[PDB]
Design a protein around this ligand. Structure first.
Ligand SMILES: O=C(O)CCC(=O)C(=O)O
Ligand SMILES: O=C(O)CCC(=O)C(=O)O
Ligand SMILES: [Fe+3]
Ligand SMILES: [Fe+3]
Ligand SMILES: [Fe+3]
Ligand SMILES: [Fe+3]
Ligand SMILES: [K+]
Ligand SMILES: [K+]
Lengths: 168, 168
């Protein structure tokens, strides 16, 4: 319901290595929550960043279906192959040190795969009085972000997740 | 135990006005968590900021007993008069927009009086799975910060509390 953990058996070190090499070639945009789109709409002219725009500017998360071709022969492409669901509008989502989100609701739930994190990173459900830490254990963590929530990174380094949108 | 709320019946508007005028004359130091000491040690040479130093540099919170003389004929002095306990090392503690603390423990518990806040500010107890919002209702909120905790401000404006240390 609120959360779930699905066994993916991703190796966290190889995932970390692959994300770091990718960000070297396609850097994150924005400052507090830094982002990089891993899926794009068909015929997107700005595929790496269109998906990172504010929700009031997003046609529909469902249009963001295309995994970038340059990922397919990387470890990230293998991650996509292992997903038990059809992802939409997947993004790298990075929290700067000491950064947090507003308390908000999203339109759909989402899956997280933690890339780099610490004990100082938590996801908080406001109305259900639940605090969750998403570990970089190579498994996939569902969070029903339609519920009122925030997330924060009280650590000294960036907290990097891959966040997959979902339909069904 | 973990928390309590004590009726002080402080007027939130007058508290806000008084804190704003004080910060005009004695500004907050630091950037992410901005602070101002309202108590000082006897014979302190830097009374407004000595109490804001890192805990590994603090002799003992118990030495910070002197409320600044210039507060006594302000509304803040009246707040001190209404406290049911003997405060030590009281500070204004301000969270910048989108800022959060590390997940940590303090040596003693503390009382909060919220000055300006929003729905995006929360205090989180990590091991007890409890999320708390401290409202600017003019009442005093005890938090046992010896327990593992953080606090965050996901709002667009600064979240300002007065935080009173305690012995007994
Ligand atoms: O953890 C993140 O970076 C995003 C948290 C959030 O607001 C979400 O997943 O909807
Ligand atoms: O809310 C604040 O600014 C301080 C939170 C904290 O870490 C404490 O009260 O010990
Ligand atoms: Fe969200
Ligand atoms: Fe987390
Ligand atoms: Fe603390
Ligand atoms: Fe709060
Ligand atoms: K588990
Ligand atoms: K109450």
């Amino acid at each position: 319901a609120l959360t779930s953990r699905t066994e993916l058996d991703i190796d966290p070190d190889k995932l970390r290595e692959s994300v770091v090499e990718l960000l070297e070639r396609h850097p994150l945009v924005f400052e507090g929550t830094r982002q990089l789109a891993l899926q794009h709409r068909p015929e997107a002219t700005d595929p790496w960043y269109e998906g990172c725009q504010r929700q009031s500017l997003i046609s529909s998360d469902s249009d963001f279906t295309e995994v970038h071709g340059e990922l397919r022969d990387t470890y990230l492409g293998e991650v996509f192959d292992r997903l038990p669901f059809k992802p939409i509008r997947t993004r790298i989502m990075a929290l700067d040190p000491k950064y947090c989100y507003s308390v908000h609701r999203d339109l759909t739930p989402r899956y997280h795969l933690a890339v780099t994190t610490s004990e100082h990173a938590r996801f908080v459900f406001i109305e259900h009085d639940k605090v969750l830490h998403i570990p970089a254990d190579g498994d996939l963590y569902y969070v029903d972000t339609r519920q009122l929530h925030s997330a924060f990174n009280g650590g000294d380094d960036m907290r990097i997740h891959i966040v997959f949108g979902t339909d069904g």
